[PDB]
Amino acid sequence: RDILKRPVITEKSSEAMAEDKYTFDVDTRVNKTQVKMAVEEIFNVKVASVNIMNYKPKKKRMGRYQGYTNKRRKAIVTLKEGSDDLF
Amino acid sequence: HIKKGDNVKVIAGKDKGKEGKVIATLPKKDRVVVEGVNIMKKHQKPTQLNPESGILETEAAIHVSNVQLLDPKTNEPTRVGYKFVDGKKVRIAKKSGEEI
Amino acid sequence: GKQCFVTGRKASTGNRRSHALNSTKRRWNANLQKVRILVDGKPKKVWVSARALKSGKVT
Amino acid sequence: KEIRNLTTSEIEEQIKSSKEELFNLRFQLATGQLEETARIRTVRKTIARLKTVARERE
RNA sequence: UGAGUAGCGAAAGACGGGUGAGAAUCCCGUCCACCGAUUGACUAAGGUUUCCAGAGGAAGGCUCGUCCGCUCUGGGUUAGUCGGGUCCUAAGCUGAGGCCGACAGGCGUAGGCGAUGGAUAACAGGUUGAUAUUCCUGUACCACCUAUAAUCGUAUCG
RNA sequence: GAGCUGUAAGUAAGCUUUGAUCCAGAGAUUUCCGAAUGGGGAAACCCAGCAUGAGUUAUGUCAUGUUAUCGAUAUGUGAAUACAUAGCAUAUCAGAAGGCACACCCGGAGAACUGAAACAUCUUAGUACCCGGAGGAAGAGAAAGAAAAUUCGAUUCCCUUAGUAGCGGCGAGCGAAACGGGAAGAGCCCAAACCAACGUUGGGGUUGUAGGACACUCUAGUUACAAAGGACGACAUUAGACGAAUCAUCUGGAAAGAUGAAUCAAAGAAGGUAAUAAUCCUGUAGUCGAAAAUGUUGUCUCUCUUGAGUGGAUCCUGAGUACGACGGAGCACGUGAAAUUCCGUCGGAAUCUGGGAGGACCAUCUCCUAAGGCUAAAUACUCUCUAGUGACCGAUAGUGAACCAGUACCGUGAGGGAAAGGUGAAAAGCACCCCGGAAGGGGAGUGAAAUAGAACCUGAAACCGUGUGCU
């Protein structure tokens, strides 16, 4: 289903990744096998591999009240065929 | 209870006497806005590009305890009531049975 | 703690006064005895006080 | 309210709403192609309105 | 008040050219000096964003500051094989049933748990502002799965 | 019943007289941890077994339910011991656990500093802390009682007796009851003899003016105790709605003030409004209001269900109990001349001519019937909820806390613990010009006031400066 949340469109995800390497931001309680199935049903492609990494919350606003941002989970799919994961 | 759209008359303040129509309402704070009364001249757009070509003067909210609802016949401020003649409530005048 | 099966004979508590009337808490235990009584189901080793044991009991 | 249809139609609608109007309208709020952003809340409420009705039938 | 007084926390810097409202102190260049069983290169505990880029100069920095481990806005960590879990247990902890005890509880059988130890399949190069036995290039190797097979069948797994 | 997406300004994008936002009752959803319960663990994490289901050629991977321990109750029931007395295996049950109101209430265990101007008896004190068990109250409770009159009639609470009688290194000190005046007002079920049936069940039967079995004759419900399960009408909480009566002119930035005229009052409580208001606004007196849920209490249903006198020929009326001896506790009562109550240990009674009590004990006379159990009201307290009051506080006060406080921080941990309110009626929060890298100023404007400019009312003293009249 819809495990993905939002693509990641930044430097290092724009060119050297541009070719067959798309960054997605996914739910924080899924494994990598699930992302290899959601990406193929949503886009109808063939996925080579998936890598995953977790981030820790940061300290947010020094001024006024102090706090933490959210933790996120960044995945990276490599396509053995096709393209057009994000436009 | 002054509703947006009707004609009123100032009872107290710098503009005692004048008459206008109600264009806004701040019901949480009991403030109406009357066209013509309480003009405030303001310094606007320090940087924001309108462009700044002077000073924008608008109205200022006044307290709803300072306006009264004129009588449609004698041209006289008055109080209000609720006759309940229609299945829905109806607002009527006080110095006369006629309506608003 | 140990308590008599048939009737709840249990340890009390009180003073141990001396001839100059000084006090110190002591305990007065009960004369319990391990015996096997013929409960319908099984004969099982239980505690019964040596006063309950008088006037007959299935042993 | 938009839940006047029969039981099968209701089951299809939820997939229709959530798999088109929610997922697609959020790959644009991220890349920056979306305006008229009030479309999101309306879609979110509709799915809630749908499920609430399905459940009542049980 | 003591008073513009004591102190400013071991150590070699000099000049030229830039930047700038502002330079003994920031950036680049040449020369000189110091460590070198270490002030060099890796990793454990621990710390927890201090890492990088472009902007900033009120406070913090024992002076100044155009600079920073300080402030603002965006970035950064990728594993079938590396280190732990789906393997094994010391010592210790725990403990169904059971024994003891005014209550609360104390002891402990089986069986669990638990490393600092025992087992167990990968290497050399390339690259980025910030990751590399993880990404890409080249060549491997391990457990599992369906397909088909030379040869079967009292073979076969225990 | 006309605006709205909270605090919190902005910025967009939209919903709404086809009834938004908002307020109440009933539902639906409700990730993970926690008694935590599938197994483990450094809470908020890791690893699984069975049953279907989704999915690929196939395994890997997901989804939904389910699987702790102890207790009861059926079941199968297959140790030694041949029948069989453990153990084991599967099923069944809004069965138990864990929190919390450090307030009140029963029970178990139980200090010391202190005082006596030392201290050992005693006191503090059966207080504090710890543990268990409850309830909205708990405990007590229907005379083996209190007394001395021609008697009272179950418990609890408050007055008063009374700082009396006592007790006591008779020191320090502790410290009653009855009566009498009142609040409140419920009294009743089992065992036993005896009758049948197949140790148990149904009927009987419950006590001091002696009761019953036995023997002949004959005659309303109290679901809060008493046997207890359900339908049953109007009050009351849970949002609201109507609701009387005023104008003018001075001084002001502004009238509610002053000055003149009037008006309502079952409404002259209170808070706001540009200054001090019964008549401007929310309100108050008084009347009106309920889909739906929950509480109290009524009239029918319902369900229970037989009531009284005479006869002792005769059998029944609670046993290792009452009580005694030794050692302790408690009674106001420190073992005394210590009755009346409880615990440990060893001895051990009678049966209505019986047995207990009336402050050692014995006779006479009065009162009362132990060794089984229940039971409401008057009383105690406040985490809370709604309505209110004060010769109570007014930011070093009042809660530690009017200010995102049990927090910044300090400690390995239990633990401790601060500081900090006010621009104006209204942001109308200083367009533009000049000096400067800025910060900050000098003008011009807003405003009644900027010596009200967000380090914002007023702005004291210490202390730091600048100018100057006599020395």
TrEMBL record, chain A:
<dbReference type="Pfam" id="PF00276">
    <property type="entry name" value="Ribosomal_L23"/>
</dbReference>
<dbReference type="InterPro" id="IPR013025">
    <property type="entry name" value="Ribosomal_uL23-like"/>
</dbReference>
<keyword id="KW-0699">rRNA-binding</keyword>
<comment type="function">
    <text>One of the early assembly proteins it binds 23S rRNA. One of the proteins that surrounds the polypeptide exit tunnel on the outside of the ribosome. Forms the main docking site for trigger factor binding to the ribosome.</text>
</comment>
<dbReference type="GO" id="GO:0006412">
    <property type="term" value="P:translation"/>
</dbReference>
<dbReference type="GO" id="GO:0005840">
    <property type="term" value="C:ribosome"/>
</dbReference>
<keyword id="KW-0689">Ribosomal protein</keyword>
<protein>
    <recommendedName>
        <fullName>Large ribosomal subunit protein uL23</fullName>
    </recommendedName>
</protein>
<keyword id="KW-0694">RNA-binding</keyword>
<dbReference type="GO" id="GO:0019843">
    <property type="term" value="F:rRNA binding"/>
</dbReference>
<comment type="subunit">
    <text>Part of the 50S ribosomal subunit. Contacts protein L29, and trigger factor when it is bound to the ribosome.</text>
</comment>
<dbReference type="InterPro" id="IPR012677">
    <property type="entry name" value="Nucleotide-bd_a/b_plait_sf"/>
</dbReference>
<dbReference type="InterPro" id="IPR012678">
    <property type="entry name" value="Ribosomal_uL23/eL15/eS24_sf"/>
</dbReference>
<keyword id="KW-0687">Ribonucleoprotein</keyword>
<comment type="similarity">
    <text>Belongs to the universal ribosomal protein uL23 family.</text>
</comment>
From TrEMBL, chain B:
<dbReference type="GO" id="GO:0006412">
    <property type="term" value="P:translation"/>
</dbReference>
<comment type="function">
    <text>One of two assembly initiator proteins, it binds directly to the 5'-end of the 23S rRNA, where it nucleates assembly of the 50S subunit.</text>
</comment>
<dbReference type="InterPro" id="IPR041988">
    <property type="entry name" value="Ribosomal_uL24_KOW"/>
</dbReference>
<dbReference type="GO" id="GO:0005840">
    <property type="term" value="C:ribosome"/>
</dbReference>
<dbReference type="InterPro" id="IPR005825">
    <property type="entry name" value="Ribosomal_uL24_CS"/>
</dbReference>
<dbReference type="InterPro" id="IPR008991">
    <property type="entry name" value="Translation_prot_SH3-like_sf"/>
</dbReference>
<dbReference type="GO" id="GO:0019843">
    <property type="term" value="F:rRNA binding"/>
</dbReference>
<feature type="domain" description="KOW">
    <location>
        <begin position="1"/>
        <end position="28"/>
    </location>
</feature>
<dbReference type="GO" id="GO:0003735">
    <property type="term" value="F:structural constituent of ribosome"/>
</dbReference>
<keyword id="KW-0689">Ribosomal protein</keyword>
<comment type="function">
    <text>One of the proteins that surrounds the polypeptide exit tunnel on the outside of the subunit.</text>
</comment>
<keyword id="KW-0694">RNA-binding</keyword>
<dbReference type="Pfam" id="PF00467">
    <property type="entry name" value="KOW"/>
</dbReference>
<dbReference type="InterPro" id="IPR005824">
    <property type="entry name" value="KOW"/>
</dbReference>
<comment type="similarity">
    <text>Belongs to the universal ribosomal protein uL24 family.</text>
</comment>
From TrEMBL, chain C:
<dbReference type="InterPro" id="IPR050096">
    <property type="entry name" value="Bacterial_rp_bL28"/>
</dbReference>
<dbReference type="GO" id="GO:1990904">
    <property type="term" value="C:ribonucleoprotein complex"/>
</dbReference>
<dbReference type="InterPro" id="IPR034704">
    <property type="entry name" value="Ribosomal_bL28/bL31-like_sf"/>
</dbReference>
<feature type="region of interest" description="Disordered">
    <location>
        <begin position="1"/>
        <end position="21"/>
    </location>
</feature>
<dbReference type="GO" id="GO:0005840">
    <property type="term" value="C:ribosome"/>
</dbReference>
<keyword id="KW-0687">Ribonucleoprotein</keyword>
<keyword id="KW-0689">Ribosomal protein</keyword>
<protein>
    <recommendedName>
        <fullName>Large ribosomal subunit protein bL28</fullName>
    </recommendedName>
</protein>
<dbReference type="Pfam" id="PF00830">
    <property type="entry name" value="Ribosomal_L28"/>
</dbReference>
<comment type="similarity">
    <text>Belongs to the bacterial ribosomal protein bL28 family.</text>
</comment>
<dbReference type="GO" id="GO:0006412">
    <property type="term" value="P:translation"/>
</dbReference>
<dbReference type="InterPro" id="IPR037147">
    <property type="entry name" value="Ribosomal_bL28_sf"/>
</dbReference>
<dbReference type="InterPro" id="IPR026569">
    <property type="entry name" value="Ribosomal_bL28"/>
</dbReference>
<dbReference type="InterPro" id="IPR001383">
    <property type="entry name" value="Ribosomal_bL28_bact-type"/>
</dbReference>
<dbReference type="GO" id="GO:0003735">
    <property type="term" value="F:structural constituent of ribosome"/>
</dbReference>
